[PDB]
Paper text:
Virus ΦcrAss001 (Kehishuvirus primarius) was the first representative of this order to be isolated in pure culture from human faecal samples. Here, we present the characterization of ΦcrAss001 using cryo-electron microscopy (cryo-EM), enabling de novo structure building and elucidation of functions for around 1,440 protein subunits constituting the virion, leading to the identification of a novel ‘crass fold’ in the distal part of the tail. The virion possesses a short non-contractile tail extending approximately 44 nm from an icosahedral capsid. The extended tail barrel formed by widely conserved paralogous ring proteins has a high capacity for storage of cargo proteins alongside the capsid cargo zone, ensuring that the proteins required for the initial stages of crassvirus infection are carried inside virions and delivered to the host cell.
The portal protein’s clip domain interacts with the tail barrel, which extends approximately 23 nm towards the muzzle protein complex at the tip of the tail. The barrel was reconstructed by imposing C12 symmetry to a resolution of 3.20 Å, and with C6 symmetry to a resolution of 3.30 Å. The barrel is composed of five stacked dodecameric ‘rings’, termed ring 1 (R1, at the portal end) to ring 5 (R5, at the muzzle end). These structures are formed by four paralogous ring proteins: R1, R2 and R3 are encoded by genes gp43, gp40 and gp35, respectively, whereas R4 and R5 are both encoded by gp34. In R5 (gp34), residues 15–26 adopt 2 conformations—5a and 5b—that facilitate binding to the 6-fold symmetric muzzle complex. The tail barrel and fibre docking hubs are stabilized by disulfide bonds, notably between fibre docking hub proteins, the fibre docking hub and ring proteins, and between R1 and R2. Unexpectedly, well-defined density at the inner surface of R1 and R2 of the tail barrel corresponds to 12 copies of an additional α-helical segment of the same protein, gp45 (residues 214–245). At the end of the tail is a large hexameric assembly of the muzzle protein gp44. A further region of density inside the tail was observed at its distal end, next to the ring-joining domain of the muzzle protein. This region corresponds to 6 copies of a 14-residue segment containing an α-helix.
Residue numbers in the entry:
A (entry chain U), B (entry chain E), C (entry chain U), D (entry chain F): 1 to 238
Write the structure that this text describes.
Amino acid sequence: MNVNEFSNEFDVLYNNIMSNAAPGLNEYEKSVLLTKAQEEIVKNYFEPAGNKYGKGLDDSPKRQIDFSELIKVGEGVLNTSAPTITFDKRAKVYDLPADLFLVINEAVDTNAGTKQIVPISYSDYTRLMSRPYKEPVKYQAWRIITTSINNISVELIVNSNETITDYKVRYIRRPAPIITTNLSSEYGDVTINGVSTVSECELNPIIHSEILQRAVELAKAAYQGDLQASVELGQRSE
Amino acid sequence: MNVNEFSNEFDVLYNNIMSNAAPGLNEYEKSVLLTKAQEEIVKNYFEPAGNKYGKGLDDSPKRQIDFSELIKVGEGVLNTSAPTITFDKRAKVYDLPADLFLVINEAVDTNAGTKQIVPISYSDYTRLMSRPYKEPVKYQAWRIITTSINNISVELIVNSNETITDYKVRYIRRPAPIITTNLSSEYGDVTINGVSTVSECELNPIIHSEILQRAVELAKAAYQGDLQASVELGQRSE
Amino acid sequence: MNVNEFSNEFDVLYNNIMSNAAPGLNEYEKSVLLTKAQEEIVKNYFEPAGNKYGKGLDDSPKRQIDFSELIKVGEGVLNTSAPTITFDKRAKVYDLPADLFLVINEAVDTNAGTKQIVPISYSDYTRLMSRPYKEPVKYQAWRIITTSINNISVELIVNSNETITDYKVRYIRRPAPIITTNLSSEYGDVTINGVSTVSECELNPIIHSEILQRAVELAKAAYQGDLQASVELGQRSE
Amino acid sequence: MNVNEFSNEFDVLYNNIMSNAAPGLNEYEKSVLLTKAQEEIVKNYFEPAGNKYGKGLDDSPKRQIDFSELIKVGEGVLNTSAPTITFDKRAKVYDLPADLFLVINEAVDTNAGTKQIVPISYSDYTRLMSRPYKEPVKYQAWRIITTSINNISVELIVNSNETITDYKVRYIRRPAPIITTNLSSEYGDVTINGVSTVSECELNPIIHSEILQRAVELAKAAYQGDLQASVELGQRSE
């Protein structure tokens, strides 16, 4: 549903049918609300407890198709460009892609075969390094985030005498903003996420209606403007 | 029932009987609300938790006959047109049809016979690639969504020394919009999902009354225009 | 109860006894409401959870007599007229009758005797085709809906080395509309479901009173016209 | 109406339908009364509470056409010639146009961007200068009037770290006098506002009737000589 339709049905659902019509929204306001609804819906549908169904990323066909056009596969770049201080003497630092929203699968290709990366918590790190062995299980590797600047930097811990060749990350791409019109203006160029040009919703058309409905709900909550509406609809930011 | 009957009965149910009759809706507004109701009804009826009966796609004769006119069978196109970075070294990339709404059944015909595709979750992917074997069961194949642009791209994982001949996908076709009248205008051509011409409801007449009722409910909720109505009737967008 | 009486007692129950009489309804409005009530009552009484009793199609004598004058027996036409792509290499495509509302019994007459058709779900299809045999039980056959255009197209899967001779479907016919008067007019011919002429209620007279009562309830809900009435009586569309 | 029409038609209204029945006004007196009447009309139709409709400058199409030929756009000139003392540390003194009657819109073009000027009262200045930050909002600038000599001088308090490059003022131009004859011909050195020659009305013809009627009322009151009439029609002088 290209952005002109986003604006047109936004008007239709917002004010064109209201009994006491509210002032129509500017295109910047509609773009901001649509982008906010996009992020809110993505976070709602990624986590099962964020929506009424209780279903997450791959808990039904609908969720799979929802995040289908947002999934991306990239590689981590070895961070030997500059020195650094790792928390572990035996961890190799890798930089994840910049346009990363959420990681759902990671894998490392070593000389000793491919191994699934298990992101270990700070409590599991302390528990596991109190043990005599302190290495992953046969077909897995460990991961902990390290000092990150401008992008997520990642420490990979593999078994001894293993060299990493590739480090693939299957992640959810950061959604691009929904901008209806060229936001360029003589009085000042405004941006949604650093882009002023027209930006289509690059997700599957299945959730475009949900994004529009959430945008309308946010618009009406802003219209009322009391604390109750803001807190009630702010619970779904998540 | 054809588009004329949708519009006429929409007027009848909306404002021709109500005491303090409200302004009649424009045909663009009626078409918008009918299309939104169509998508909402489809999403409610696919998921058991989305409707009051607790019944999903195939949980009763009515639910079968509801989507009977929306089911379609196609084939995935092998994505060797251009190079790409697969998350799994032994996965063949396939492109699904553009007009895909939900996948309900997939199957792949290999040299070793037909094999049912099981869409494995990311947590199930991590669990399964931690085992020594890392291959599907005898009569199945595995599947994960990969980098998708403009249409869903799919990674198929089969057993070793197996070649894929075809990849059939039983999916639900994307519903076409319901447009009452030719939306062509001298002041600007407006579209619902990229089409301005008249578009009939391409689903079974069993749910035409259902779509009309949902459209009327959405129309009256928009008429009320308060945050309450939008929030409570957005719960059914799903 | 022929349609003149439908209109006369509709008036009597709607406005002729009211203290502050509402405007009388047009014959088109009454026809639309009666047809809507007809479909709503059929769907109420087919599914047990749709009515207060909790009784479905054949759960009491009343329901049997209710759907008695709506049941029909027809045959499926082999769809070798044109080529197609079946989801199963070994399924024969058959086209169901056009005036089909709900299927309650299906059967196929093969050279190896008659067999009851079991409509298998998309989950049962995946479960059953993961098994070594992948054929029906002795005296049954499987069924899944395929690409359908203008009428439900059906795939029949029988055991190997079995040829289908007949395919009988015992279904519930689509109800004809209730039209009181010839809706032909000089200002434009209106239709309920594509027919303008007088149309009697072709169901058993047992549910005519229920259809009239539901029509009156819909009329009064439309008269009030608030969102509450529309949503409350829209739950019974089902 | 040319000046000759204002004089001739004053006598169809003041002088008892040009009957020489009322006292008889010279052309200098008629010019004086017309000038006073136009000033009164401008002041009354500007303030909503000053007229009979409760409508101000831009509150109806008639008011928009009334002041259409007075609205002027002019730039302010930096008052760097005189090194006076400003009440605010970061105030740049600007001189306004000499033919200024009422200001209605002011804007300042800074290096950061254009900023709408808010004419801030002496109470709001003390209120907003009792706070931590003490700067305008991101899209506005303040303005207070300062030591003025035979002109209008305004302090532009724009946010620190910003420089003013322009200052546009949209205002109501001071109306020119209405004079119906060369005053020097018969009256020695009398001027209305410094002009001794024929001066036409610089206003839209829509309010010429209003101005003439007000002049007639003022003449009749000034000649009836009652204190009550003078004080009663003195109410509308503002």
